[PDB]
């Protein structure tokens, strides 16, 4: 999750997309063509340094 003036960029592993919330949810991965890259790089383990 990254906060910005435009909205909230978050990556949902379940749906395999890179969303942006700005009042309405927008799947940036689908709009700009990144569905495969995210669907191949997803895992269940949470982030840790």
């Amino acid at each position: 999750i990254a906060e910005s003036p435009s909205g909230l960029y978050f990556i949902d592993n379940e749906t395999n997309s890179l969303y942006l919330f700005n009042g309405e949810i927008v799947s940036l991965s689908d709009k700009l063509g990144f569905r495969q890259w995210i669907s191949t790089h997803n895992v269940h383990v949470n982030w840790e340094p």
């Binding site: 592993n13 379940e14 395999n16 997803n42 269940h44």
Partner: protein, 49 residues
């Protein structure tokens, strides 16, 4: 279930989109595509290639 799509048939759970192509529940099913060829439909055409 989690980030994976599952199925249930014949008393067993089949994980989808993980095996070899065109093999559904251990059986090979074909794939096909039908598309009408109607260009200059008022004219009588001979389909050559």
């Amino acid at each position: 279930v989690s980030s994976e799509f599952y199925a249930f048939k014949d008393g067993k759970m089949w994980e989808q989109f993980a095996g070899d192509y065109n093999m559904f529940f251990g059986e090979y099913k074909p794939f096909s595509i039908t598309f009408v060829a109607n260009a200059e439909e008022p004219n009588d055409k001979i389909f050559n290639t």
